[PDB]
Design an enzyme around this catalytic site. Structure first.
Site, PDB file in Angstrom:
ATOM      1  N   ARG A 135      15.967  -4.061   4.634  1.00 39.21           N
ATOM      2  CA  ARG A 135      15.448  -5.379   4.675  1.00 39.21           C
ATOM      3  C   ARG A 135      16.321  -6.272   3.841  1.00 39.21           C
ATOM      4  NH1 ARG A 135       9.595  -6.164   2.224  1.00 39.21           N
ATOM      5  NH2 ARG A 135       8.939  -5.080   4.144  1.00 39.21           N
ATOM      6  N   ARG A 183       9.943 -11.211  -4.121  1.00 36.54           N
ATOM      7  CA  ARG A 183      10.333 -10.981  -2.739  1.00 36.54           C
ATOM      8  C   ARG A 183      11.050 -12.216  -2.178  1.00 36.54           C
ATOM      9  NH1 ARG A 183       7.961  -6.676  -0.834  1.00 36.54           N
ATOM     10  NH2 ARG A 183       7.624  -4.982  -2.281  1.00 36.54           N
ATOM     11  N   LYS A 209       5.036  -6.222  -6.389  1.00 32.10           N
ATOM     12  CA  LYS A 209       5.721  -7.275  -5.645  1.00 32.10           C
ATOM     13  C   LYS A 209       5.124  -8.645  -5.977  1.00 32.10           C
ATOM     14  CE  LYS A 209       4.057  -5.254  -2.027  1.00 32.10           C
ATOM     15  NZ  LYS A 209       4.089  -5.018  -0.540  1.00 32.10           N
ATOM     16  N   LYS A 215       5.335 -12.860  -4.653  1.00 31.36           N
ATOM     17  CA  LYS A 215       5.692 -13.641  -3.470  1.00 31.36           C
ATOM     18  C   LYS A 215       5.521 -15.141  -3.687  1.00 31.36           C
ATOM     19  CE  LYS A 215       4.911  -9.971  -0.120  1.00 31.36           C
ATOM     20  NZ  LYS A 215       4.105  -9.508   1.063  1.00 31.36           N
ATOM     21  N   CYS A 250       2.494  -7.100  12.977  1.00 33.34           N
ATOM     22  CA  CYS A 250       3.382  -6.279  12.136  1.00 33.34           C
ATOM     23  C   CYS A 250       3.948  -5.089  12.927  1.00 33.34           C
ATOM     24  CB  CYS A 250       2.652  -5.779  10.900  1.00 33.34           C
ATOM     25  SG  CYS A 250       1.411  -4.539  11.257  1.00 33.34           S
ATOM     26  N   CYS A 254       5.950   2.697  10.445  1.00 31.76           N
ATOM     27  CA  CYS A 254       5.180   2.406   9.227  1.00 31.76           C
ATOM     28  C   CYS A 254       4.336   3.580   8.786  1.00 31.76           C
ATOM     29  CB  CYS A 254       4.243   1.205   9.426  1.00 31.76           C
ATOM     30  SG  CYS A 254       3.356   0.774   7.910  1.00 31.76           S
ATOM     31  N   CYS A 312      -3.148  -2.020   9.938  1.00 30.89           N
ATOM     32  CA  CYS A 312      -3.873  -1.593   8.761  1.00 30.89           C
ATOM     33  C   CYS A 312      -4.220  -2.852   7.918  1.00 30.89           C
ATOM     34  CB  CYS A 312      -3.087  -0.520   7.957  1.00 30.89           C
ATOM     35  SG  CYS A 312      -2.097  -1.158   6.561  1.00 30.89           S
ATOM     36  N   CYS A 354       0.253  -7.655   6.667  1.00 31.13           N
ATOM     37  CA  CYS A 354       1.667  -8.088   6.725  1.00 31.13           C
ATOM     38  C   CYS A 354       1.917  -9.241   7.712  1.00 31.13           C
ATOM     39  CB  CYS A 354       2.590  -6.912   7.023  1.00 31.13           C
ATOM     40  SG  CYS A 354       2.556  -5.516   5.861  1.00 31.13           S
TER      41      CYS A 354
HETATM   42  C1  SRM Z   1       7.007  -1.720   3.818  1.00 32.21           C
HETATM   43  C2  SRM Z   1       5.723  -1.696   4.688  1.00 32.21           C
HETATM   44  C3  SRM Z   1       5.068  -0.302   4.709  1.00 32.21           C
HETATM   45  C4  SRM Z   1       5.443   0.505   3.459  1.00 32.21           C
HETATM   46  O1  SRM Z   1       4.902   0.197   2.342  1.00 32.21           O
HETATM   47  O2  SRM Z   1       6.327   1.407   3.607  1.00 32.21           O
HETATM   48  C5  SRM Z   1       4.941  -2.869   4.122  1.00 32.21           C
HETATM   49  C6  SRM Z   1       4.129  -2.795   2.896  1.00 32.21           C
HETATM   50  C7  SRM Z   1       3.091  -3.754   2.479  1.00 32.21           C
HETATM   51  C8  SRM Z   1       1.965  -3.384   1.589  1.00 32.21           C
HETATM   52  C9  SRM Z   1       1.676  -2.063   0.922  1.00 32.21           C
HETATM   53  C10 SRM Z   1       2.198  -2.035  -0.463  1.00 32.21           C
HETATM   54  O3  SRM Z   1       3.400  -2.306  -0.605  1.00 32.21           O
HETATM   55  O4  SRM Z   1       1.384  -1.758  -1.348  1.00 32.21           O
HETATM   56  C11 SRM Z   1       1.148  -4.616   1.552  1.00 32.21           C
HETATM   57  C12 SRM Z   1      -0.114  -4.871   0.783  1.00 32.21           C
HETATM   58  C13 SRM Z   1       0.441  -5.404  -0.543  1.00 32.21           C
HETATM   59  C14 SRM Z   1      -0.612  -5.636  -1.601  1.00 32.21           C
HETATM   60  O5  SRM Z   1      -0.302  -6.221  -2.656  1.00 32.21           O
HETATM   61  O6  SRM Z   1      -1.751  -5.212  -1.370  1.00 32.21           O
HETATM   62  C15 SRM Z   1       1.861  -5.540   2.467  1.00 32.21           C
HETATM   63  C16 SRM Z   1       1.448  -6.928   2.751  1.00 32.21           C
HETATM   64  C17 SRM Z   1       2.313  -7.975   3.316  1.00 32.21           C
HETATM   65  C18 SRM Z   1       1.923  -9.401   3.266  1.00 32.21           C
HETATM   66  C19 SRM Z   1       0.635 -10.017   2.762  1.00 32.21           C
HETATM   67  C20 SRM Z   1       0.876 -10.896   1.560  1.00 32.21           C
HETATM   68  C21 SRM Z   1       0.648  -9.933   0.472  1.00 32.21           C
HETATM   69  O7  SRM Z   1       1.628  -9.287  -0.021  1.00 32.21           O
HETATM   70  O8  SRM Z   1      -0.543  -9.801   0.210  1.00 32.21           O
HETATM   71  C22 SRM Z   1       3.086 -10.039   3.868  1.00 32.21           C
HETATM   72  C23 SRM Z   1       3.270 -11.469   4.191  1.00 32.21           C
HETATM   73  C24 SRM Z   1       3.812 -12.434   3.264  1.00 32.21           C
HETATM   74  O9  SRM Z   1       4.433 -11.947   2.313  1.00 32.21           O
HETATM   75  O10 SRM Z   1       3.595 -13.645   3.577  1.00 32.21           O
HETATM   76  C25 SRM Z   1       4.011  -8.915   4.174  1.00 32.21           C
HETATM   77  C26 SRM Z   1       5.359  -9.009   4.828  1.00 32.21           C
HETATM   78  C27 SRM Z   1       5.973  -7.949   5.566  1.00 32.21           C
HETATM   79  N1  SRM Z   1       5.629  -6.729   5.585  1.00 32.21           N
HETATM   80 FE1  SRM Z   1       4.319  -5.887   4.270  1.00 32.21          FE
HETATM   81  N2  SRM Z   1       5.132  -4.028   4.738  1.00 32.21           N
HETATM   82  C28 SRM Z   1       5.837  -3.746   5.854  1.00 32.21           C
HETATM   83  C29 SRM Z   1       6.332  -4.731   6.828  1.00 32.21           C
HETATM   84  C30 SRM Z   1       6.363  -6.142   6.564  1.00 32.21           C
HETATM   85  C31 SRM Z   1       7.208  -7.052   7.427  1.00 32.21           C
HETATM   86  C32 SRM Z   1       8.505  -6.567   8.062  1.00 32.21           C
HETATM   87  C33 SRM Z   1       6.183  -7.527   8.554  1.00 32.21           C
HETATM   88  C34 SRM Z   1       6.495  -8.481   9.751  1.00 32.21           C
HETATM   89  O11 SRM Z   1       5.943  -8.271  10.891  1.00 32.21           O
HETATM   90  O12 SRM Z   1       7.271  -9.480   9.614  1.00 32.21           O
HETATM   91  C35 SRM Z   1       6.982  -8.140   6.525  1.00 32.21           C
HETATM   92  C36 SRM Z   1       7.649  -9.403   6.682  1.00 32.21           C
HETATM   93  C37 SRM Z   1       8.153  -9.616   5.142  1.00 32.21           C
HETATM   94  C38 SRM Z   1       9.475  -9.466   4.318  1.00 32.21           C
HETATM   95  O13 SRM Z   1      10.632  -9.338   4.788  1.00 32.21           O
HETATM   96  O14 SRM Z   1       9.393  -9.525   3.041  1.00 32.21           O
HETATM   97  C39 SRM Z   1       6.190  -2.345   5.929  1.00 32.21           C
HETATM   98  C40 SRM Z   1       7.140  -1.631   6.874  1.00 32.21           C
HETATM   99  C41 SRM Z   1       6.835  -1.596   8.355  1.00 32.21           C
HETATM  100  C42 SRM Z   1       8.062  -1.152   9.172  1.00 32.21           C
HETATM  101  O15 SRM Z   1       7.999  -0.120   9.879  1.00 32.21           O
HETATM  102  O16 SRM Z   1       9.102  -1.835   9.159  1.00 32.21           O
HETATM  103  N3  SRM Z   1       3.530  -7.729   3.792  1.00 32.21           N
HETATM  104  N4  SRM Z   1       3.017  -5.018   2.911  1.00 32.21           N
HETATM  105  S1  SF4 Z   2       0.052  -4.292   7.937  1.00 28.26           S
HETATM  106 FE1  SF4 Z   2      -0.130  -2.168   7.562  1.00 28.26          FE
HETATM  107  S2  SF4 Z   2       0.463  -1.294   9.437  1.00 28.26           S
HETATM  108 FE2  SF4 Z   2       1.214  -3.332   9.416  1.00 28.26          FE
HETATM  109  S3  SF4 Z   2       3.290  -3.078   8.703  1.00 28.26           S
HETATM  110 FE3  SF4 Z   2       1.913  -3.590   7.076  1.00 28.26          FE
HETATM  111  S4  SF4 Z   2       1.507  -1.657   6.180  1.00 28.26           S
HETATM  112 FE4  SF4 Z   2       2.192  -1.300   8.185  1.00 28.26          FE
HETATM  113 CL   LIG Z   3       5.897  -6.403   2.156  1.00 30.01          CL
END
Ligand code: SRM
Ligand code: SF4
Ligand SMILES: [Cl-]
Ligand code: SRM
Ligand code: SF4
Ligand code: FES
Ligand SMILES: [Cl-]
Ligand SMILES: [Mg+2]
Ligand SMILES: [Mg+2]
Lengths: 554, 96, 567
Positions: free
Chosen positions: A59, A128, A202, A204, A420, A426, A466, A470
């Protein structure tokens, strides 16, 4: 009481060990290395369709979503050379590149770094990608939002040279100065702000101009809004703090949260206020249970007023009162538009940001043949920037030929939808999102047609696999949040604007049963909405109690 | 491979998509169907069913002998479907 | 919508009488489903013998209620005779300080239970959707915080005893008692609706017609003594004392439980959380408040998710505390610091502190049979001893005159019972549940397979070069219900197939730590393939005196699996 990740960070010598040894061993790496490699912007994954086939997602870091020509070209080639043939545009204006074999990982990252790019801090317990308006508008407050975001990204970039040590063996002086001032710092460390332990999780940030909510601001740890001045001259910033989507099913002490208005600062103060906020999270904020570590929980616990006073200690002065702002509007920046300087830009609609097979080839041919810089939007789309008016027709022709459509020819459901990646790569997914969303949108369109709703009508649909959220489902007019192999929680109450927090409406709606919920909901919307009232506003005005009565009666 | 598993229960007929590596009882459960069980490891007769049509893989069970298997008996807790299958459930008391 | 079959049964039963009452006296060797569910509340379980392949052979297991594990002389004598006369010749000591007596024919059930009731005993509430046996320190120490823990456990048992009178109606036609008057503080606490806990007009002021959503488990102890495996219970109560050893109050933990089910990851074991502290006079009010909170809020739709642990997992401890505080009528104080937990077996020759001795009898799996049984009964009868059952399935002979130490030691040794010094330390801290042949939930052996497993563990130790005084806590169950608390073991084997176990690691000698599942479907024959590398790496890299449990948690499953796979 401290988490396993804290101990890992502690023993790592600023994110080097044992990643360094593990990188050069097996197709995978050990648990410690798995945690550490995130800080360098890569994630070990396995393919859950298959019987552990390991690969690495990477990424990028791209403040404002800006992507130089050279980087686009390198990423495009790396995807085919060492990946799975796709680039994945994300909801934070970033690229992901899936499927890289461990033996090629250093080659790939090194190529990114040598091609005006970086993955540093794309994951990990740190800042981030910083969001900003994706459109290359020349308008002052837009440019200033973009500059500010870049400054914040640079400010909060890790300063240990661990990244460059593992993979490869300009900065505005205002940033260096802000970074170096003493709150706040660890004066003698390779990480003046982060220290050895980095953040608890993280972090943001999103920056924007008043009125423009492309960035889904309310969702971030910090939201920064450029305020101007009747002439359009920036004078300062309103700040919000403490949003986040992340929650976990059946753990009611976890929840999504809207950032609170914190206050206003004069423009010259911004990096100090931000650093003060970050330091407050760094110092306070839970390192025992990751899960309650995000800043949103600290603010929920303390309340905004006590949090503000704490931030004010590290800022060295009082926030001014949060200034009134205009309403919030979503902007996709799609289609043919003026930059304001004589050149055009074109926003390419991309379902789920998945750029592959031909669309990919054609995009690269355009970008390469006109030497364009490009920009990624928080709705997983791609903007072609700096286009000469003379090139409008051949570009339009090339895109149409490739099957990439102008907004008018796309179902409006698709234009605002996001999903997502979820399955197969994932490791947290419970169900499909990206691979199931397109058939869902078509079904929603068929419900609309059956009910008699016009095909120009739409609702924001966001799907995740889930509850981590994201694709920011908890801001959707219609959110599906995976809660089982073939089931979703349905969330309602988000607005076209993203100004409103959705609430969970029903649990464990089976994929097959979606129409059983949607048809009565949308029948009632069609039957009793006020003139031009969105499904979201209609949901909040009518209330869940009546909506459930209607769903059950059906 | 996911298979259509028809369960004929005393409360009614229910239809489920059970994957080939998922036990029949375990999917029923996921879908909130109430089926009988006790040991859930194939060494008793609480979860006993009769295959009306199609086939299951139940080699993980150890209670039923072969005459009973040939007669179409199935222990729903330790059976993966190997085709679209139709199974009468709650049939223990047809033995013990 | 959404209520379980058991709820409807309780509802239709007229406080646990109907149709049990008519089924008890039918000609059949068994009883109907409704009766099967109801008879649990009266402390008996219909079972069938799974060794006999062709045909259901019915019998009834019976379980006693013995707060603190205390067993009066008269009761021991009656249970010992009943086991031979109407049972299968054994008494089974349990992990909740109770007896079970297996194999009773339906036609003799009333005779047996009546004999228990007439001999200073009870089975009421030993099973069912109610308060189970209350744990306390088993040793008959005269130390104040120990005596007070014991009294408190008894008061809690009495508080949460069913009041309907159904029990006496069925088994004893309503008579008697004689028994002690219940301490008045208990009655007062029970009655007392000043905070809306009760059903004022009901034969069950606390339980009502529905009772609880599920079984409910309490353990009381003194600071430092974790014989009761406190963290595992719905409620853990710890006696706190001043500098002089005078009790002043209780710390309280809530929301533990072992029960889970294979391949249902929404089920899990859980450690109880610190809740807070109450002054000593408040205890029964706080406990009732906790029980009422479960009564009112626990899930009654799906029994898998009914235990209090799920409510607390879902709500979080702070929201749960505020809800309990409504029924308590005041605020909990902050949980006070406690010393480190220590396991105590109470085995061997010890002092009560008043001039009399006690002797803790090591019993493998609590199975008291053949001769050991005969000799124990002779000793207990000859010297008129009260006894106490421990949460590690052992028996304490209490109140021994110093003059009797030698003849008792001689009689025990002659019977083939051993002093701790002559037992392999693996046995001393090992436990297994009964599992096969009479448990209907078992997926494999536990009690009948554990002793050969311990000897094979010893042979792995010897091969690796680990000394024969070294040990690890081993606990084995035949299924994931976790009756021998395997999820607290340093080495837990949890049946997941006819001849396989899931192996769990990460418990500690203290039981202060929750184990995690390490490997699935380890065949009985393959056990050495896992254990040898694990224990080699423990021997090779442990810190001085570091337990296998602490070593596991420090080294991490990733490195342990690497070591196991490399082997
Ligand atoms: C890395 C993981 C799974 C993992 O932990 O191994 C993941 C973790 C996570 C995880 C799990 C964790 O890391 O604990 C969480 C829950 C985090 C938390 O604090 O509870 C999560 C909330 C989001 C959120 C919600 C905002 C937030 O953080 O609450 C956002 C949105 C935002 O930042 O506006 C977000 C933005 C992405 N998140 Fe996310 N996110 C994943 C994909 C993404 C991307 C690629 C989604 C998309 O469709 O565009 C994201 C785009 C962001 C980037 O480049 O930085 C993802 C990989 C999926 C794959 O197969 O590629 N994730 N991702
Ligand atoms: S929302 Fe959940 S299932 Fe979707 S990419 Fe994030 S961690 Fe994976
Ligand atoms: Cl993320
Ligand atoms: C004898 C005893 C085990 C022992 O070796 O000592 C025991 C034996 C059985 N338990 Fe247990 N459990 C015994 C303590 C435990 C404990 C330990 C504890 O309480 O500290 C646990 C784990 C803690 C917990 O409750 O989570 C335990 C968790 C279960 C469960 C799963 C409970 C749950 O809520 O999920 C069941 C099945 C059920 O009730 O759902 C169960 C059910 C059973 C049954 C009655 C099977 C059944 O429901 O028909 C057992 C009969 C076996 C036999 O043939 O004798 N037993 N059971 C136990 C000692 C208990 C007593 O009250 O006097
Ligand atoms: S753990 Fe399982 S097998 Fe063992 S006694 Fe309990 S229910 Fe039976
Ligand atoms: S429940 Fe025992 S064989 Fe299926
Ligand atoms: Cl039990
Ligand atoms: Mg898009
Ligand atoms: Mg023992």
């Amino acid at each position: 009481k401290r988490s396993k990740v804290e101990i890992i960070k502690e023993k790592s010598n600023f994110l080097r060990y044992p990643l360094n040894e593990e990188l050069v061993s097996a197709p995978n790496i050990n648990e410690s290395a798995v945690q550490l490699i995130k800080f360098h912007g890569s994630y070990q994954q396995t393919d859950r369709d298959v019987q552990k086939n390991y690969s690495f997602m990477l990424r990028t870091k791209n403040p404002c979503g800006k992507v130089p020509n050279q980087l686009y070209l390198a990423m495009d080639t790396l995807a085919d050379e060492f990946g799975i043939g796709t680039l994945r545009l994300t909801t934070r204006q970033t690229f992901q590149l899936h499927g890289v074999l461990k033996k090629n990982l250093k080659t790939v990252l090194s190529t990114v770094i040598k091609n005006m790019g970086s993955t540093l801090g794309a994951c990990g317990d740190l800042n981030r990608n910083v969001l900003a308006p994706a459109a290359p508008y020349v308008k002052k407050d837009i440019l200033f939002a973009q500059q500010t975001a870049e400054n914040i990204a640079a400010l909060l970039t890790p300063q240990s040279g661990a990244y460059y040590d593992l993979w490869v063996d300009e900065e505005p002086p205002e940033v260096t100065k802000a970074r170096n001032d003493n709150g706040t710092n660890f004066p003698d460390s390779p990480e003046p702000i982060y220290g050895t332990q980095y953040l608890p999780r993280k972090f943001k940030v999103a920056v924007t101009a008043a009125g423009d909510n492309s960035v889904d601001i309310l969702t971030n740890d910090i939201g920064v809004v450029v305020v101007s001045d009747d002439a359009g001259e920036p004078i300062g910033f309103n700040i919000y703090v403490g949003g986040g989507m992340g929650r976990t099913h059946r753990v009611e002490t976890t929840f999504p949260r809207l950032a609170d208005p914190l206050g206003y600062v004069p423009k010259e103060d911004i990096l100090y206020a931000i650093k003060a906020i970050v330091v407050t999270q760094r110092e306070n904020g839970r390192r025992d249970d990751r899960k309650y570590s995000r800043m949103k929980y600290m603010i929920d616990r303390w309340g905004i007023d006590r949090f503000r006073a704490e931030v004010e200690k590290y800022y060295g002065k009082k926030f001014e009162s949060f200034r009134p702002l205009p309403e919030w509007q979503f902007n996709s920046y799609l289609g043919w538009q003026e930059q304001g300087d004589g050149k055009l830009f074109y926003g390419v609609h991309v379902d789920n940001g998945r750029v592959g097979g031909q669309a990919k080839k054609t995009l690269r041919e355009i970008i390469e043949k006109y030497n364009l810089d490009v920009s990624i939007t928080p709705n997983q789309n791609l903007i072609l920037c700096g286009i000469d008016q003379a090139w409008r027709e051949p570009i339009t022709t090339a895109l149409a030929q490739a099957g990439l459509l102008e907004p008018k020819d796309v179902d409006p459901l698709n234009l605002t939808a996001m999903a997502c990646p979820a399955l197969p790569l994932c490791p947290l997914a419970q169900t499909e999102a990206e691979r199931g969303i397109l058939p869902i949108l078509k079904r929603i369109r068929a419900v609309f047609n059956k009910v008699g709703i016009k095909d120009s009508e739409s609702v924001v649909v966001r799907i995740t696999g889930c509850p981590n959220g994201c694709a920011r489902p908890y801001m959707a007019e219609l959110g599906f949040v995976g809660d089982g192999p073939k089931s979703y929680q349905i969330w309602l109450g988000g607005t076209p604007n993203q100004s409103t927090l959705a609430e969970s409406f029903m649990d464990k709606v089976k994929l097959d049963d979606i129409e059983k919920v949607l048809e009565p909901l949308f029948t009632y919307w069609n039957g009793t909405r006020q003139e031009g009232e969105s499904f979201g506003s209609f949901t909040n005005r009518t209330g869940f109690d009546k909506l459930k009565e209607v769903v059950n009666k059906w | 491979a996911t298979y259509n598993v028809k369960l004929i229960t005393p409360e009614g007929e229910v239809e489920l998509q059970v994957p080939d590596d998922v036990y029949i009882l375990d999917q029923a459960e996921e879908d909130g169907i109430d089926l009988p069980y006790s040991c859930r490891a194939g060494s008793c007769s609480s979860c006993a069913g009769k295959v009306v049509s199609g086939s299951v893989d139940q080699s993980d069970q150890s209670y039923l002998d072969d005459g009973q298997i040939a007669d179409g008996w199935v222990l729903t807790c330790h059976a993966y479907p190997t085709s679209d299958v139709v199974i009468e459930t709650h049939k223990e008391e047809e033995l013990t």
